Amino acid sequence: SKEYHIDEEVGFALPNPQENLPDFYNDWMFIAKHLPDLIESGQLRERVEKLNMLSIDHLTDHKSQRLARLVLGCITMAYVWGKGHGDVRKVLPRNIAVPYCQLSKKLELPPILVYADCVLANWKKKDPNKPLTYENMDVLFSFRDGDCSKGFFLVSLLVEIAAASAIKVIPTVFKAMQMQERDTLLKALLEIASCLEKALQVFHQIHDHVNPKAFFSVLRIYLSGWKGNPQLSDGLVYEGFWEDPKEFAGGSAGQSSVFQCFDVLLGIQQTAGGGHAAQFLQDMRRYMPPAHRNFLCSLESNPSVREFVLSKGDAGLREAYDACVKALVSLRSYHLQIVTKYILIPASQKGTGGTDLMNFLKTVRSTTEKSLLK
Amino acid sequence: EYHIDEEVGFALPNPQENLPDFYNDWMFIAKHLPDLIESGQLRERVEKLNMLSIDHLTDHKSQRLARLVLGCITMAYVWGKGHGDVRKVLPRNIAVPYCQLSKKLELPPILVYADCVLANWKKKDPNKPLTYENMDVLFSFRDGDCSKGFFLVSLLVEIAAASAIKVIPTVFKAMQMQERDTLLKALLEIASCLEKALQVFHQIHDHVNPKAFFSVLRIYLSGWKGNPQLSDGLVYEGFWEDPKEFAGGSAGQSSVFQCFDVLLGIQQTAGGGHAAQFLQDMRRYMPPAHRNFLCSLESNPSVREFVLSKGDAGLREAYDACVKALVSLRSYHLQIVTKYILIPASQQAKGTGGTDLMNFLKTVRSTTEKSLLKE
Ligand code: HEM
Ligand code: HEM
Ligand SMILES: O=C1C[C@H](c2c[nH]c3ccc(F)cc23)C(=O)N1
Ligand SMILES: O=C1C[C@H](c2c[nH]c3ccc(F)cc23)C(=O)N1
């Protein structure tokens, strides 16, 4: 789907992301590529302040604007959070802020690092002639040595890639409903269920490549934002763009379009009600690439798959729909065990998005389980 | 597919006036809200109701009427006489069928604009046109609350806007087909329809008085979200266990102004500000098909950007006439807000929707005025 920017094999992930920016931005690229060293040495904040306000006009293609976004995004996190020990910058300099906020308005994304930057556009394959496995992949940017950003960003991307198998069959579901093709629909539903069951084994890889201490005490600090954050009470000031401090949420997979589009497809109203969970997931759509929030829109505008399956007294169609729902609760249940190991236990010795964490995740999982027909 | 009517726009065409005889007990209370409240009989009559199933509400129109009936009863039950003696728990016999019908229609279990304006009307004579004299509301809260005047004038503005909404596809097609002259003619036609909506808004003064709005109607239209009177929200007994929060009714829930702001690229919902957050949140208080419509206009190429890139004074002037008609509507609205809210409040504060009134309204008007290409 070139209209919604959905790839056949990588789904919502930006296929083959650009590694190098035009030579005119070698100054931005030097900093971004040297964050572990410039942060640890205390040279980072001074290298950002010494920068000259570069124009965003030399970024022509979409892949170059997305890489620049990832570059300026990682530098903004590093600048604001420093060494990640509580000494924060409340103001972002104009020579970095002005081109960052301009590029953000151009790509319709807020001026903060989002999941679409650090995960969907933060990757490469080692050997282009080899498959999309963890051993054949790497990330473009990290924050600090030992932060486990490779394992963390890649495991997220791999889940995203595993979801692409199910994403491509969505139009088969909608065409079968209108054309009233029950057998085609049942087959499409079983196929979605199959794919979501396979994505659960991809989640298992987090244990192998991410250590709980490094995620909690380091990576989570850098991915955090300035909305409801006591550290930056009124938000961040983007010098030369807005005279007032703007609040933006930190990165999260709540910004992933995958789980949101399966909730929409299956008629799981996660966005329904006035709860905090429904509120966050709705707000995170404005942190997604515009083409992806437009895709979510278009899926919502279609007639309900849940209502169609219910309007028929067909046990076979009901079992296939439930197989898709059961696969989602199983993903969300395993995910709760991850958050216990990576956030709750290390905290005993808040996440990157800023939610109530456990209550938020339990409310979203509870809603999914309640969609079960049997 | 977007439940947009050619003549009434976002309003529900010819709403149902009566429910099947099975719900007569709901209808009696809803139809006699002024009398039952005044006599202190409302809360008792509600508590004596049997729990009725929603299965006898078959068609969309009968489901929309039932939502209006249960929504009015709920506001009456929670607010009572309108002086502070509040109810924090809504009985199961009403709360259960109300949330079921609400879940089915994808609307929160609180009276919204789509109920009390869009589905709360009729024509006296079906052969005569849609004029105030040929129309009436179906439900009221109190004797002298001016609810007929209030709801009907909002509806009449909503209907005046219907004429501009039907030319939206012409605008997008003209852009796609690169038909400069068609686009210009379509933009001037939207502007003309928006200018006529302002003349309809003037009728407010003859059918609504400030004391009745501020001290009565405003009380019943209010909700339980950030409200000190129901700090935790409302308990929907037998449906949810915890109290839930929902904002009160407002024309922030109207899809009219929201769709013209999206059409013209007036970034009202963009950013994390109070005004933007409120207008985005009110989309989940709109019927699903109307929230889908807004969302789908956002996915279309920018009318603003198309106009800005052509170096065509004629096109810019037609675009600016559309923006100007919205600033004119919002500037008139600030005078209505002084007459119906600021003056009565000083003779003794929020509106029904719960925003920080003056800031919110000035931020929305400012964002519209700043969209003008030329002053
Ligand atoms: C180190 C491992 C992980 C931890 C500690 C973790 C933590 C969290 C937390 C705290 C939230 C709540 C939002 C917030 O306030 O930040 C969340 C939401 C979410 N996470 Fe994870 N997560 C991890 C890995 C993953 C992976 C690998 C994916 C796969 C793409 C993922 C997908 C999601 C989704 C979709 C949500 C939104 C809630 C839902 O739809 O159920 N997470 N995660
Ligand atoms: C007695 C008459 C009226 C009063 C006192 C009044 C008051 C208000 C207030 C207080 C708000 C802010 C939202 C809130 O906190 O509640 C508001 C918003 C709004 N009102 Fe009015 N209003 C009145 C009549 C109308 C009418 C007839 C229309 C036309 C349909 C209208 C259209 C709007 C719109 C579109 C908004 C959203 C803000 C915007 O887009 O500018 N209002 N109104
Ligand atoms: O605390 C967390 C981690 C988790 C998450 C999973 N994949 C991510 C990619 C980027 C990012 F900033 C956060 C995440 C989340 O949603 N909250
Ligand atoms: O306080 C107010 C009144 C005004 C308004 C205009 N038409 C309405 C229809 C229903 C409703 F509950 C409120 C309104 C608004 O947006 N805030």
UniProtKB/Swiss-Prot annotation, chain B:
Entry annotated with the keyword Metal-binding: yes
Q: What does this protein do?
A: Catalyzes the first and rate limiting step of the catabolism of the essential amino acid tryptophan along the kynurenine pathway. Involved in the peripheral immune tolerance, contributing to maintain homeostasis by preventing autoimmunity or immunopathology that would result from uncontrolled and overreacting immune responses. Tryptophan shortage inhibits T lymphocytes division and accumulation of tryptophan catabolites induces T-cell apoptosis and differentiation of regulatory T-cells. Acts as a suppressor of anti-tumor immunity.
Q: Which Pfam families match?
A: IDO (PF01231)
The induction comment states: By IFNG/IFN-gamma in most cells. Exogenous inflammatory stimuli induce the expression of IDO1 in antigen-presenting cells such as dendritic cells, macrophages and B-cells.
Q: How does it assemble?
A: Monomer.
Which PROSITE patterns does this UniProt record tie to the protein?
A: IDO_1 (PS00876), IDO_2 (PS00877)
Question: Please, which domain of life does this record's source organism belong to?
Answer: Eukaryota
- List the taxonomic lineage: Eukaryota, Metazoa, Chordata, Craniata, Vertebrata
GO cellular component assignments: cytoplasm; cytosol; smooth muscle contractile fiber; stereocilium bundle
Activity regulation: the record says: Activity is inhibited by and MTH-trp (methylthiohydantoin-DL-tryptophan), modestly inhibited by L-1MT (1-methyl-L-tryptophan) but not D-1MT (1-methyl-D-tryptophan).
Q: Which family does it belong to?
A: Belongs to the indoleamine 2,3-dioxygenase family.
Please describe the organ and tissue distribution of this protein's expression. Expressed in mature dendritic cells located in lymphoid organs (including lymph nodes, spleen, tonsils, Peyers's patches, the gut lamina propria, and the thymic medulla), in some epithelial cells of the female genital tract, as well as in endothelial cells of term placenta and in lung parenchyma. Weakly or not expressed in most normal tissues, but mostly inducible in most tissues. Expressed in more than 50% of tumors, either by tumoral, stromal, or endothelial cells (expression in tumor is associated with a worse clinical outcome). Not overexpressed in tumor-draining lymph nodes.
Q: Which cofactor does it need?
A: heme b
The subcellular localization recorded is: Cytoplasm, Cytosol
GO terms for biological process, alphabetical: 'de novo' NAD biosynthetic process from L-tryptophan; female pregnancy; inflammatory response; kynurenic acid biosynthetic process; L-tryptophan catabolic process; L-tryptophan catabolic process to kynurenine; multicellular organismal response to stress; negative regulation of interleukin-10 production
A GO molecular-function annotation: indoleamine 2,3-dioxygenase activity
| Record field: catalytic activity | D-tryptophan + O2 = N-formyl-D-kynurenine; L-tryptophan + O2 = N-formyl-L-kynurenine
Q: What is its main location?
A: cytoplasm
Cite the annotated pathway.
Amino-acid degradation; L-tryptophan degradation via kynurenine pathway; L-kynurenine from L-tryptophan: step 1/2
Q: What protein name applies here? A: Indoleamine 2,3-dioxygenase 1
Print the miscellaneous field.
IDO1 is the target for therapy in a range of clinical settings, including cancer, chronic infections, autoimmune and allergic syndromes, and transplantation. IDO1 and IDO2 are 2 distinct enzymes which catalyze the same reaction. IDO2 affinity for tryptophan is much lower than that of IDO1. 50% of Caucasians harbor polymorphisms which abolish IDO2 enzymatic activity. IDO2 is expressed in human tumors in an inactive form: tryptophan degradation is entirely provided by IDO1 in these cells. IDO2 may play a role as a negative regulator of IDO1 by competing for heme-binding with IDO1. Low efficiency IDO2 enzymes have been conserved throughout vertebrate evolution, whereas higher efficiency IDO1 enzymes are dispensable in many lower vertebrate lineages.
**Cofactor binding summary note:** Binds 1 heme group per subunit. In the active form, the heme iron is in its ferrous state Fe(+2). The catalytic cycle does not alter the oxidation state of the heme, but IDO1 is prone to autoxidation.
Per UniProt, which keywords does this protein have? Cytoplasm, Dioxygenase, Heme, Immunity, Iron, Metal-binding, Oxidoreductase, Tryptophan catabolism
The UniProt entry, under InterPro entries, shows: Indolamine_dOase (IPR000898), Trp/Indoleamine_2_3_dOase-like (IPR037217)
Gene for this protein?
IDO1
Residues the record lists as binding heme b:
H333
